[PDB]
Amino acid sequence: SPWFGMDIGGTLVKLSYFEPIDITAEEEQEEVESLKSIRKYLTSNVAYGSTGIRDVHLELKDLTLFGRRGNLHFIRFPTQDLPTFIQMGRDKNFTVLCATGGGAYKFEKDFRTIGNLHLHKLDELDCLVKGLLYIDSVSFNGQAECYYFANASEPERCQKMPFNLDDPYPLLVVNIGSGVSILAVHSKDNYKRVTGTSLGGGTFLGLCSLLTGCESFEEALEMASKGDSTQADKLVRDIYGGDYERFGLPGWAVASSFGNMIYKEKRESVSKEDLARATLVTITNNIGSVARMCAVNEKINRVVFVGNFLRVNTLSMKLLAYALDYWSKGQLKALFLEHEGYFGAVGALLGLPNF
Amino acid sequence: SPWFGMDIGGTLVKLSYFEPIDITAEEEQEEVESLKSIRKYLTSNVAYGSTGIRDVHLELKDLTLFGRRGNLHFIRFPTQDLPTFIQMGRDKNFTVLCATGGGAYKFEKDFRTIGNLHLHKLDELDCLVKGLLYIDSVSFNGQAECYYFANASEPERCQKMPFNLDDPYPLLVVNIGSGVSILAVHSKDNYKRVTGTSLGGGTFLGLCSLLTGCESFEEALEMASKGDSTQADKLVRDIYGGDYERFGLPGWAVASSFGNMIYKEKRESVSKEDLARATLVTITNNIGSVARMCAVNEKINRVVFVGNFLRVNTLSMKLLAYALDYWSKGQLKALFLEHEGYFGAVGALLGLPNF
Ligand SMILES: Nc1ncnc2c1ncn2[C@@H]1O[C@H](COP(=O)(O)OP(=O)(O)NP(=O)(O)O)[C@@H](O)[C@H]1O
Ligand SMILES: Nc1ncnc2c1ncn2[C@@H]1O[C@H](COP(=O)(O)OP(=O)(O)NP(=O)(O)O)[C@@H](O)[C@H]1O
Ligand SMILES: O=C(Cc1ccc(C2CC2)cc1F)N1CCN(c2nc3ncc(F)cc3o2)CC1
Ligand SMILES: O=C(Cc1ccc(C2CC2)cc1F)N1CCN(c2nc3ncc(F)cc3o2)CC1
Ligand SMILES: [Mg+2]
Ligand SMILES: [Mg+2]
């Protein structure tokens, strides 16, 4: 069987695929044409159909896994297109599938329409933590998997810098997918889901599409990059005329997200780009604030953000880096991971020896 | 001088007015015609101009204050109309004004266009806490000022019931105005602002107006009462197919607010009423969740909600009552106050002896 791990989320399916590179002459002969066709198809294309994408820059090369050397590939496509994925599988025969995410339960019966396919549903928490610790342990092709934005306060100095996670505990993991799950990791076998919030990546994309008519996550980010969120938001200075220094609230802090939109004349003058940026800022600040409160309650100072809300989203990453440092008075550090969307899929793959 | 307290917020001005009812024959003679005209105008009208409203049902009758007996009146109007209020004052002469809220600073120079008027800006935190403790201490005309929703889990049993605050400490106060301020009250002289969130009443009204075209807070609530938030929100059951009982998440919990709006066909079928209800649910759940995290961090189990976001808003109150009890496993109790919008204005009035 080909070595796969799958994380079927509410929005995106993430797939990790181990491509063996130590195939001998005898192993190559004893290989089914269908398996050769799949390995060729996956390694020769970067786009799969109309909506599948291989994130080639994330590939881990010459990894040793389960006693074999190979390349670890990272592939994503919309959960809405999983029927196409399953129909491709039924055309080409199939295979033991380790799968996590809500879709491993929701679509269990659909996966079993592939004859003799064994689906093993693995716990999302075990998969995320195991995959995160594994990828950081093997490194990103010799580079750090984990990074932070140094001097996030000053833009002419703010820069991505590596962060060591050799002793990773304790760790607060903020998984920003459709919603937000917050995990406290105390050891490799002691971790829990602290809480969550429903204001996550699906809120950003859903509200953005409603307010602006954007048709993709990427377009929503492009609009936001051009907008001014203060056209929609009411700031501390709009209410006080300046700072509220009795409680250390700077004049630029947002007092009411979309609060200026209670005035009809302001709703008629705001641009789509402004509304996209205000949506991004609102969601990101709320995630950071909830992360801060959980970190204080859990007595954890390292807060790592994962998921795909932050994919190609430097605005939200830098906002989290600056805001978490500022509002924590420097007590909390925002951390990011290069493979932030794929840890559940990797952890599922890592469960394969159990079956 | 007439006895006023004013809380000038970002959205609404709240005014508490003490109408003396023990006026003697000699005091009545030594009364200026302008003062008689104001007292008559305020006590003979329930609507002031086009946007001012006296909340007659909140009136405290036969209150003893500063050695006099009188009635305490509660009046509100939009901050946008404060220029009209100030221009009425300049027409009729004026007076020592105790004022709080952001507008006491922002509009200080405007108040001083009234000749010889002395404006004393009072701390918003001292005013809110002092006014809250005062009103509960004197009672709501013999009835409890504080109430909760008993058996908030079962709708055929859920009912408003009084709550005693004779020993009020400690207390977590959640002030839902344009944004949200969260206060920890440990004694009558030991209290602090824990944190806040920008997702408050102005977010509900601003987003609602953008999404539905509603032109008032009341219309936004009327729309929400007719909507189904699950048409816009993605629930736990939409992602898992049912409950996620590994982490005790029921299938009806919202996993992604507006998360179903990432699909164009669902954006085209959702009603304004559905979007209004999803906006209300999103904002209310986020406020409750942040209140819960702060209560856990502060080790306080009594959480009282104030502001005007909850005025004529039973939906949000019952949602807070049910959700705070459910997600806290019954460890936190949601409390409400009849005079929830006016405590800052009362506390400002109570500062009058200092001047
Ligand atoms: N190509 C994309 N399509 C859709 N959303 C994207 C895309 N790229 C980034 N995103 C963002 O990533 C979020 C989904 O992240 P992801 O971690 O894959 O969630 P999920 O696993 O599908 N959902 P969940 O069931 O809650 O764990 C979306 O809500 C968007 O904000
Ligand atoms: N008649 C109304 N007009 C506008 N908003 C209303 C009205 N009635 C209730 N509300 C709600 O009440 C919220 C404002 O509550 P309020 O406590 O008066 O805030 P504020 O003091 O004006 N703002 P802040 O400066 O943040 O303290 C609005 O955001 C609405 O959600
Ligand atoms: O109180 C507030 C908002 C607010 C609400 C109402 C008013 C009233 C007019 C008086 C004023 C205000 F300023 N804020 C402080 C906490 N906050 C925050 N904490 C974070 N932690 C990590 C992050 F990544 C991001 C973060 O944002 C957001 C701003
Ligand atoms: O984790 C979540 C939301 C969530 C996010 C992502 C997922 C992923 C698919 C896996 C599932 C989820 F369910 N929730 C628990 C905490 N929560 C809450 N706590 C409250 N406290 C007091 C209140 F008044 C209201 C409250 O709401 C909101 C729901
Ligand atoms: Mg996910
Ligand atoms: Mg206020």
Q: Which domains does chain B have, with CATH numbers?
A: 2-143+342-355 (3.30.420.510), 144-227+271-341 (3.30.420.40), 228-270 (6.10.10.60)
Question: Which tokens is A32 given?
Answer: 């089914």
Classify the C-alpha dihedral A39-A42-A44-A49 as positive or negative. positive
Q: Which atom of ligand 4 is nearest to the CA of B320?
A: 24
Breaks (C-N over 2.5 A) in chain A follow: 94
- Work out which ligand 3 atom sits closest to the CA atom of A285: 25
Phi first, then psi: give them for residue B328, nearest 5 degrees. -90, 5
Buried b (16+ CB within 10 A) or exposed e, A25-42: eeeeeeeeeeeeebbeeb
A105 close to B (CB below 8 A): yes
The burial class, CB within 10 Å (0-12 / 13-18 / 19+), for B39 is middle
Q: Which residue has the tokens 């019931």?
A: B161
Report the C-alpha gap between A127 and A130 in whole angstroms.
Answer: 5
Beta bridge pairs of residue B97: B119
What tokens does B205 get?
């009204």
Structure tokens of A34?
A: 């269908």
Do A270 and A285 contact (CB within 8 A), yes or no?
Answer: no
CA distance B229 to B279: 8
CA distance A274 to chain B (A): 13
SS3 of A100-128: the string is ECHHHHHCHHHHCCCCCCEEEECCHHHHH
Ligand 4 and B323: CB distance under 6 A: yes
Instruction: Give the residues after which the backbone of chain B is interrupted, taking a C-to-next-N distance over 2.5 angstroms as a break.
Output: 94
Residues present in chain A in total: 355
Strand residues in chain B grouped as ranges (E): 3-8, 12-20, 47-48, 52-54, 60-65, 68-78, 96-100, 118-121, 146-150, 159-162, 171-176, 180-185, 191-197, 234-235, 254-256, 302-307, 333-337
What six digits make up the tokens of B50? Answer: 């086009």
Please choose, from the candidates B40, B3, B67, B2, the residue with its C-alpha nearest in 3D space to the C-alpha of residue B346.
Answer: B3
Residue A288, CA distances (Å) to A282, A313, A327, A335, B237 in order: 10, 15, 10, 12, 26
The Cα–Cα gap between B203 and B11 comes to 12
Q: State both tokens at A7.
A: 């994380």
B34: CA distance to ligand 4 center in Å? 56
Residue of A24, A20, A17, A23 whose CA lies nearest to A3: A17
Please list, in sequence order, all residues whose beta carbon lies within 8 angstroms of the beta carbon of residue A189, skipping any fewer than 6 positions away. none
Q: How far is the CA of A221 from the centre of ligand 1 (A)?
A: 13
Compute CA B253 distance to the chain's CA centroid, rounded to the nearest angstrom. 27
Sign of CA dihedral A234, A238, A242, A248: negative
User: Shortest Cα distance from A209 to chain B (angstroms)?
Assistant: 7
Pairing of strands B191-197, B180-185: antiparallel
Residue B310 CA, ligand 2 centroid: distance in Å: 9
- Those residues with Cβ within 8 angstroms of residue A91's Cβ, 6 or more apart along the chain or in another chain: none
Instruction: Determine which residue's CA is closest to atom 7 belonging to ligand 4.
Output: B255
Q: What is the resolution of the experimental data for this entry, in Å?
A: 1.9
Half-sphere exposure of B248 (CA within 13 A, CB side): 9
Q: B324 CA distance to ligand 1 centroid (A)?
A: 28
- In this structure, what DSSP letter does residue A140 have? B
**CA A249/CA A254 separation, integer angstroms:** 10
| Environment class of A252 (CB within 10 Å of its CB; exposed 0-12, middle 13-18, buried 19+) | exposed
The token pair that represents B295 in the structure block: 């209560």
Cα B97 to the center of its chain, rounded Å? 22
Interface of A with B in 168-187 (CB under 8 A): 178-179
Closest CA to B127 of B355, B346, B305: B346
- Contact between B86 and B76 under an 8 Å Cβ cutoff? The reply is no
Amino acid at A171: L
Tokens standing for residue A63: 């990894």
Contact A106, A124 (CB under 8 A): no
Total residues belonging to chain B: 355
Phi, psi of B100, deg, nearest 5? -135, -175
B109 close to A (CB below 8 A)? no
Is A326 at the interface with chain B, CB within 8 A? no
Q: CA–CA separation, A251 vs A242, rounded Å?
A: 5
Q: What span, in angstroms and rounded, lies between the C-alpha atoms of A131 and A125? A: 10
CB contact, 8 Å: A297 with chain B?
yes
Ligand with minimal distance to A339 CA: 1
Instruction: Count Cβ atoms within 10 A of the Cβ of residue A101 and give its class: 0-12 exposed, 13-18 middle, 19 or more buried.
Output: buried
Euclidean distance between the first and the last CA atom of chain A, given in angstroms as a whole number = 12
Q: Is A282 helix (H, G, I), strand (E, B) or coil?
A: helix
Rounded distance, CA B79 to CA B73, Å? 19
**How far is the C-alpha of A286 from the C-alpha of A270, rounded, in Å?**
22
B181 has binding-site annotation:
yes
Asked if B60 and B71 count as a contact pair (C-beta separation under 8 A), the reply is: yes
Number of cross-chain residue pairs from A and B with Cβ atoms under 8 Å apart: 197
| Calpha distance B319→B310 (Å, rounded) | 11
Residue type, B171: L
Distances in whole angstroms, Cα of residue B280 to Cα of each of B152, B202, B205, B284, B285: 18, 11, 9, 6, 8
Work out the end-to-end distance of chain B between its first and last CA atoms, rounded to an integer number of angstroms: 12
Closest CA in chain A for residue B178:
A256
DSSP state of B251: T
Which residues have a Cβ under 8 Å from the Cβ of B92 and sit 6 or more positions away? B34, B37, B38
Classify strands A302-307 and A333-337 as parallel, antiparallel or unpaired.
parallel
**Interatomic CA distance for residues B286 and B197, integer angstroms:** 9
Q: Which two tokens stand for residue A304?
A: 């790592």
Residues with CB under 5 A from ligand 6 (ion): B 9, 177
| Token pair for A161 | 């810098």
Nearest ligand for residue B288 CA = 4
Q: Report d(CA A269, CA B210) in Å as an integer.
A: 12
Residue B202 is classified by DSSP as H
DSSP structure class, residue A314: H
Catalytic residue among B124, B273, B298, B340: B124
Partner-chain contact B209 A267, CB within 8 Å: yes
Which residue of B193, B258, B298, B300 to mutate against A (max A Cβ within 10 Å)?
Answer: B258
Whether A178 has a binding-site annotation, put simply, is yes
CB A303 within 8 A of CB A335: yes
Strand partners, A185: A171, A191
CA dihedral over B54, B57, B60, B62, signed as positive or negative: positive
Q: Are B255 and A178 in contact (CB under 8 A)?
A: yes
Asked if B242's CB is within 8 angstroms of A203's CB, the reply is no
Q: In the annotation, is B124 catalytic? A: yes
Cβ count within 10 A of residue A163:
17
Min Cα–Cα distance to chain B from A351, Å: 18
A193 is in an annotated binding site: yes
| Residues A134, A130: Cα–Cα separation, whole Å | 6
CB atoms within 10 A of CB A89: 18
Per residue, the 3-state secondary structure of B43-99, as one string, reads: HHCCEECCCEEECHHHCEEEEEECCEEEEEEEEEEEHHHHHHHHHHHHHHCCCEEEE
Q: How many CA atoms lie within 13 A of B277 on its CB side?
A: 19
| Short-list A101, A95, A99, CA closest to A114 | A95
CA torsion sign for A210, A213, A217, A218 is negative
**Is the C-beta atom of A12 inside 6 A of ligand 1?**
yes
Task: Tell me which residue in A201, A257, A294 faces B198 most closely, judged by beta carbons.
Answer: A257
User: Could you count the other beta carbons within 10 Å of the beta carbon of residue B186?
Assistant: 13
Name the experimental technique: X-ray
Q: Among candidates A281, A279, A284, A282, which has minimal Cα distance to A207?
A: A279
Q: Considering only CB atoms, which chain A residues are within 8 Å of B242?
A: 105
Rounded to an integer, what distance in angstroms lies between the CA atom of residue B68 and that of residue B355?
17
Flag whether residue A242 sits within 8 Å of chain B, measured between CB atoms.
yes
